[PDB]
Amino acid sequence: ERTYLYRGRILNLALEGRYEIVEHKPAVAVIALREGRMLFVRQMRPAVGLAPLEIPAGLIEPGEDPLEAARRELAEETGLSGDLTYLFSYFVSPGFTDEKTHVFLAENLKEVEAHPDEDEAIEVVWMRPEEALERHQRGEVEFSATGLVGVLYYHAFLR
Amino acid sequence: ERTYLYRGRILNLALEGRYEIVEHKPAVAVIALREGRMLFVRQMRPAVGLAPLEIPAGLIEPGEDPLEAARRELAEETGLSGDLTYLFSYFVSPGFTDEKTHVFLAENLKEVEAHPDEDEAIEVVWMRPEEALERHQRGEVEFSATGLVGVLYYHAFLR
């Protein structure tokens, strides 16, 4: 029942009667704790003009299931591997997009890929979740949904 | 620095160099607990083809601040008013959209508007958060980001 206005690289824009719909690939995100610090990442995000606090995340590529994508994103963004457990999923904004995010826990982390130079295209930000939440409350950092989900999951289940 | 491909009702689509960007109005969401039940809502969401478990939510309209929009959405979607406290915010998916959601807690709820007939355009779903999480784990219901945030916040801070 949909008409396409635009077919792009990570999204399509469609109209469905009165509804404006953005089709988007599904995503993964990985919650990881070590020594009381959560593994956050930051990168410049042109859609928002700032670098919010996120957790390792990205799009599921052709051929992959969510577990495999989660492994890949953890390795590509942080150089780590771990034992991954599926937690839950969510639709990021079901009033306009079908993007669905599958969230995993990672335990028993090991460095498998060295962090080249001082590369900060993706910045690795180990931070206690309590400190992330305080910084946010102070107006000092913004959250993505994945970062906030990580912080809340920690406070609910990992203390 | 942006070129517009489409200017719509709740969104615009723009390109910014290589980046596909969906501009979207900011949103609010309201977490409310009563007698151990969380106030969820469900509605058909054409972008996803199903009705996920959400919490009362919607777009900030012209003239409003987030607190006012939260009050309005609580009343319009559930017929309730309460004492609202700002909690935190998040970007729903900062890899492609600027939608930012401001989350509030509502306490001391009162019914101010009667629920007409048996109207289920927005369905009011009081449910224990533990039951929502079990149903999701069983594959029986999907979450929006707002619904999942509500469930996690409850488990972290409201028991």
Question: Would you write up a description of this structure?
Answer:
The structure is a homodimer of 159-residue chains. With 159 residues, chain A is an alpha+beta fold. Chain A has one domain (1-159): Nucleoside Triphosphate Pyrophosphohydrolase (Alpha-Beta Complex), CATH 3.90.79.10. The first copy, chain A, contains three helices and nine strands, in the order ββββββαβββαα. In chain A, β1 and β2 form a beta hairpin. In chain A, α2 (129-137) packs across α3. The PDB classes it as hydrolase. The entry lists the keywords Nudix motif, ADP ribose, Cytosol, hydrolase.
Evaluate the radius of gyration of chain A. Answer: 17 Å
CATH superfamily of chain A: Nucleoside Triphosphate Pyrophosphohydrolase
H-E order of chain A: EEEEEEHEEEHH
What is the CATH C-level name of chain A? Alpha Beta
Largest sheet of chain A: 6 strands, mixed
Give the CATH architecture of chain A.
Alpha-Beta Complex
